[PDB]
Amino acid sequence: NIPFPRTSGARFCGAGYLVYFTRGKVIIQDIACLLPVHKSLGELYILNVNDIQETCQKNAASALLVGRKDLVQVWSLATVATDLCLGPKSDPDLETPWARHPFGRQLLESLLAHYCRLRDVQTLAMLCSVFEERERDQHDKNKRLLDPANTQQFDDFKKCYGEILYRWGLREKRAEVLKFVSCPGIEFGVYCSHCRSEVRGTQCAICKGFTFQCAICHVAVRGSSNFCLTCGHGGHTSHMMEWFRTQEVCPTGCGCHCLLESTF
Amino acid sequence: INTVDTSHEDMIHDAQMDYYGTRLATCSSDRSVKIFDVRNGGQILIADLRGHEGPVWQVAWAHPMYGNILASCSYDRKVIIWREENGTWEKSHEHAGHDSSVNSVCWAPHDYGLILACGSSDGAISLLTYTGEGQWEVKKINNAHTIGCNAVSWAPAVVNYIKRFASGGCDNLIKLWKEEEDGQWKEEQKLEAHSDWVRDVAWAPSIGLPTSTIASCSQDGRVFIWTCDDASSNTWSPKLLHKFNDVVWHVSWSITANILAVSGGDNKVTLWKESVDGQWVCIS
Amino acid sequence: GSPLDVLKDERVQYWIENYRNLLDAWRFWHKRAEFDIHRSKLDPSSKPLAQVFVSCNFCRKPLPRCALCLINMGTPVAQFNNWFTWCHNCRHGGHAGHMLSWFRDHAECPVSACTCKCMQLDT
Amino acid sequence: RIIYCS
Ligand SMILES: [Zn+2]
Ligand SMILES: [Zn+2]
Ligand SMILES: [Zn+2]
Ligand SMILES: [Zn+2]
Ligand SMILES: [Zn+2]
Ligand SMILES: [Zn+2]
Ligand SMILES: [Zn+2]
Ligand SMILES: [Zn+2]
């Protein structure tokens, strides 16, 4: 049992390519005008939690550089629908929430259903991110523009767009997008400078003191740090930016050429 | 439009590109598995891999997550892995547990780990699982297909997990396999709506839409785009796209599962897209 | 001069210590490193101890992986862009170049669901 | 206005 050998094939590779061959040489296509995602928009789009208004306008401007009539109108509506003057209140018997207004949840759920049919992940992921006693509990569910019974689909949208962004080659943007998801071995320990014991954390337990002391400015380090695996003399990252820029020896009189024994 | 002119005399059988779109791996019939470097429109020969008894059918790259890995399946008990270490490509591992020739390889989704599935012509599937320290935990099940098992596909990961894959062989049937909690790989619904000889099977990438689609091809020329609109139902309703005049070899989805490219014996490539009314029409 | 006759006295050590301190006040930090290299090349006795362990709390596998790059730590692949930076209060990190690219624009640990501003936590 | 005049 063995089929007959084949002499042609075609596969979709990368995120915007097409490879094929025929009965030989192999050609490579750049067919990126037939997919609903655009690579330039993924390089121009921004996300910034501290100021929603600016992001919507910047993305609306960026949508005009590509010539998509749809996105300009959508991002325009997003600005007015996500203003800070429409904040929900705490008591149900004080106002009707903007979510129940027919320009709230129902318009969002009509854009999302439109873009789903087009398979446009890139807009769904962005939209789902920008918008992110019994009576009191019911109110909290009622006052949200995204249904609390559909979190899984939104997480799936964000995850798939992140995988695409990894495929294209952009690393920072994937982290930016993934920062909005609702659902969230061997390590290194520090030998304390007072009790001479391994300490799990920037602060000790016996003497409760600082466990790590920088090997350039001798000031205790509490945030970022780099260290050598062989000799083990570490400090702030910018300090070794400056130090290992030219020299190749331990800054603490150790003799260990850390540049060669650490960068595996 | 870019072109590469391969050296190897015998006709090419398969060709695939890496994850990022930088390198190229071409299988052939003489012996070679030559790999190029097509960055910025180039041809520069990175390596020229050698060593195989018979001709090689498929080459499959793994995720960049676990280094540079490439798998090959040939006309022998041969699934050699071709890892590259310290800036040079070389043999890394071999496994020869299947009597007849093995004609399909498919890497598992990177969420599970590093798993490879290969279906031999004898009618068995071998799962190569990486356990660390340069070791494997290869297990297999036999008597799955009478005279077939010549195409395998993995299913997109959904929400611990429930591993699934889709196969198909000479029996003109396609079976779905679900791994039990114990570890044994049981069987499940097996669709049978083809006539002569299935050749390949592909399963669609997921976006979040609660529908699963599978394409299939055969010597009939009939391509069926199966569909299932309910996770609990486990029902698939076949549909026809076009009855080709020749044998249909390969089907491949797109990144967003909106375009399907079909190639076969007629020595042509066709692109297809679903219309709003539910009919599948060509584009080029 | 004599290594093991005068350098053991508790009067020549205080002078060296005070000189190092006075150097550390003026913020001349590289000069202190040069002085320490000279001192160590002269006598061996005053040699610092190690600082960072490699223990495995969860005592054929890997463990740490980059954040932005997410590739497994260790394994091979402008020479300082391969150390693995570690946060202390956050226990995260990655490649030096990747994290420095990340931290120039934004200020937060790239791992989502973290609120540690690692770069400006120490100033 | 956004809805009815581009
Ligand atoms: Zn202590
Ligand atoms: Zn410092
Ligand atoms: Zn060292
Ligand atoms: Zn040292
Ligand atoms: Zn361990
Ligand atoms: Zn990295
Ligand atoms: Zn931190
Ligand atoms: Zn963090």
For chain D, the distance separating the N- and C-terminal CA atoms, rounded to the nearest angstrom, is 8
Is C66 annotated as ligand-binding?
no
* DSSP structural state of residue B100: S
Q: Which residues of chain C are within 8 Å of residue B135 when distances are taken between CB atoms?
A: 60
* Contacting residues of A for B20, CB less than 8 Å apart: 14, 167, 169
Annotated binding site of A for Zn(2+): 192, 195, 204, 207, 217, 228, 233, 236, 239, 250, 254, 256, 258
Residues C106, A176: C-beta atoms closer than 8 Å = yes
* Bridge partners for B213 per DSSP: B227
A232 touches chain C (CB under 8 A): yes
Which secondary-structure segment (H or E) carries A59? helix A52-64
C29 backbone φψ class: left, alpha, beta (φ>0; ψ -120 to 50): alpha
Q: Are B33 and B27 in contact (CB under 8 A)?
A: yes
Decide: helix, strand or coil at residue A69.
Answer: helix
Return the axis-axis angle of helices A69-81 and A52-64, rounded to nearest 10°.
170
**What's the gap in Å between the CA of A246 and the closest CA on chain B?**
26
Among candidates B4, B263, B271 on the partner chain, residue whose Cβ is nearest the Cβ of A26: B4
C-alpha separations of B186 from A94, A164, B119, B143 in Å: 58, 33, 16, 12
Contact with chain C for residue B132, Cβ under 8 A:
yes
Sheet holding B164-168, edge to edge: B151-154, B164-168, B174-178, B190-191
Question: What Rg value do the Cα atoms of chain A yield, rounded?
Answer: 27
CA-based torsion, A181, A183, A185, A186: positive or negative: positive
Q: Who's near B279: CB < 8 A, 6+ residues apart?
A: none
CA distance C18 to chain B (A): 49
Q: Locate all alpha helices (DSSP H) within A147-248, ordered by sequence.
A: 151-168, 172-178, 237-243
Angle at A62 between CA A59 and CA A66, to 5 degrees: 135
DSSP letter at B109 equals: P
For residue A262, the ligand closest to its alpha carbon is 3
C-alpha B166/C-alpha B236 separation (Å) is: 13
A89-92, Cβ contacts within 8 angstroms, sequence gap of 24 or more: A92/A135, A92/A136, A92/A139
Measure the CA dihedral B1/A36/B216/B33, to 10°: 40
- Cross-strand bridge partners of residue C86: A225
How far does the centroid of ligand 1 lie from the alpha carbon of residue A31, in Å? Answer: 61
Query: Is A190 in CB contact (< 8 Å) with chain C?
Result: yes
Tokens linked to A104: 């709230």
Cβ distance B84 to B68 under 8 Å?
Answer: yes
Strands (E), C56-108: 86-87
The rounded distance, in Å, linking the Cα atoms of A142 and A164 is 33
What dihedral do alpha carbons B118, B121, B124, B125 form, nearest 10°? 10
CA distance A101 to C69: 43
CB contact under 8 A, C60 and B131: yes
CA nearest A79 in D: which residue?
D2
d(CA B100, CA C50): 58
Contact B172, B196 (CB under 8 A): yes
Please work out, in degrees rounded to the nearest 5, the angle formed at the alpha carbon of residue A186 by the alpha carbons of A244 and B133.
100
- By the 8 A CB rule, do B33 and B82 touch? yes
Task: Name B70's bridge partners.
Answer: B61
Q: How many residues does chain A have?
A: 264
Closest CA to B16 of A21, A163, A23: A21
Asked if C118's CB is within 8 angstroms of A224's CB, the reply is yes
Cross-chain residue pair A253–C39, CB shorter than 8 Å: yes
Query: With contact defined as beta carbons under 8 Å apart, do B168 and B201 qualify?
Result: yes
- Of C53, B226, B258, the residue nearest A230 (C-alpha): C53
A83 vs A53: CA distance, rounded Å: 7
Binary contact (B208, A156; C-beta < 8 A): yes
Of B11, B16, B26, the CB nearest to A13: B16
Q: How far is the CA of C100 from the centre of ligand 6 (A)?
A: 11
CA atoms within 13 A on the CB side of A113: 6
* Dist. CA B111–CA B109, nearest whole Å: 5
> From CA A219, how far away is CA A209, in angstroms rounded?
13
Per-residue tokens: A106: 């129902």
Chain A nearest-CA residue for B29: A5
From residue C27, alpha-carbon distances to B94, B247, C23 in Å are 60, 78, 7
Contact A124, B256 (CB under 8 A): no
Ligand 1 midpoint to CA A196 (Å): 7
- Check B207 against A17: CB less than 8 A apart: no
Residues of D within 8 A of A80 (CB-CB) are: 2
Kindly state the tokens that stand for A123.
Answer: 């807009």
DSSP-assigned states of every residue in B160-212: ----EEEEE-TTS-EEEEEB-SSS-B----EE----S-EEEEEEPPPSS-S-E
Distance CA B139, CA C81 (A): 41
The structure tokens listed for B275 are: 């219309």
Q: Do B1 and A3 touch (CB under 8 A)?
A: no
Q: Cα separation of A50 and B231, whole Å?
A: 39
State whether residue A209 sits within 8 Å of chain C by CB.
no
Tell me the C-alpha to C-alpha distance, in Å, between residue C32 and each of A220, A243, B24, C25, C27.
Answer: 17, 12, 53, 11, 9
Q: What are the DSSP calls for C28-51, one per residue?
A: -HHHHHHHHHHHHHH-SSS-PPP-
Ion ligand 1 contact residues with beta carbon within 5 A: A 192, 194-195, 204, 206-207
Residues 6 or more apart whose Cβ sits within 8 Å of residue C21: none
* Cross-chain CB nearest to C51 (options A180, A234, A251): A234
Specify the residue for token string 């676990």. B66
User: What is the arrangement of strands in the sheet containing B35-37, beginning at the earlier edge strand?
Assistant: B12-17, B23-28, B35-37
- By the 10 Å C-beta count (0-12 exposed, 13-18 middle, 19+ buried), B110 is classed as middle
What are the angstrom distances between the C-alpha of A162 and each of A47, A165, A180? 13, 5, 11
- Chain A: residue whose CA lies nearest to B264: A8
Structure token digits, residue A244: 């290992």
Largest distance between two CA atoms of chain D: 8
Q: Per the structure block, which two tokens stand in for C105? A: 């624009």
Q: Residue C53 in contact with residue A199, Cβ under 8 Å?
A: no
Nearest beta carbon to residue C76 from set B64, B66, B86: B86
Give the separation between CA A216 and CA C29, rounded to whole angstroms.
Answer: 6
User: How many residues are recorded in chain D?
Assistant: 6
Q: Is B200 exposed, middle or buried (0-12, 13-18, 19+ CB in 10 A)?
A: buried
Q: Which residue has the tokens 């498919």?
A: B106
Q: Which helix (H) or strand (E) holds A148?
A: none
User: Which burial class, exposed, middle or buried, applies to A249 when counting CB atoms under 10 A from its CB (0-12, 13-18, 19+)?
Assistant: middle
For the stretch A210-219, contacts whose Cβ atoms lie closer than 8 Å and that sit 24 or more positions apart, written own/partner, are: A212/C51, A212/C52, A212/C88, A213/C51, A214/A239, A215/A239, A215/A251, A215/A252, A215/C51, A216/A240, A216/A242, A216/A243, A216/A251, A216/C29, A216/C30, A216/C33, A217/C24, A217/C29, A218/C24
Cα–Cα distance for residue pair A94/B200, rounded to 1 Å: 62
Q: Could you give the CA distance from residue A214 to residue A212 in angstroms, rounded to a whole number?
A: 7
In angstroms and rounded to an integer, the radius of gyration of the C-alpha atoms of chain B is 19
Tokens, residue B190:
């097996």
Residue position matching structure tokens 């008894």: B53
Separation between Cα atoms, residue B266 and residue B248, nearest integer Å: 8
Q: What is the CA radius of gyration of chain C?
A: 21
Please provide residue C88's backbone torsions phi and psi, each rounded to the nearest 5 degrees.
-95, -50
CB A11 within 8 A of CB B262: no
In this structure, the number of other CB atoms found within 10 A of the CB of residue B260 comes to: 23
B-to-C residue pairs, Cβ atoms closer than 8 angstroms = 13
- CA–CA distance, A81 with A131 (Å, rounded to integer): 9
A153 touches chain D (CB under 8 A): no
Q: CA-CA distances (angstroms) from residue B168 to B99, B148, B176, B184?
A: 19, 7, 9, 20
Q: How many angstroms separate the CA atoms of B224 and B240, rounded? A: 5
Q: Are A243 and A216 in contact (CB under 8 A)?
A: yes
Cα gap B92→C69, rounded to integer Å: 25
Taking CA atoms, C22 is separated from C8, C25, C27, C28, C48, in Å, by 22, 5, 9, 9, 20
Contact yes or no, D with C (3+ CB pairs under 8 Å): no
Which residues of chain B lie closer than 8 angstroms to A7, CB-CB?
11, 13, 267
Residue C85 amino acid letter: T
Asked if C61 lies within 8 A of B132 by C-beta distance, the reply is yes
Q: Would you say the C-alpha torsion C63, C69, C74, C75 has a positive or negative sign?
A: positive
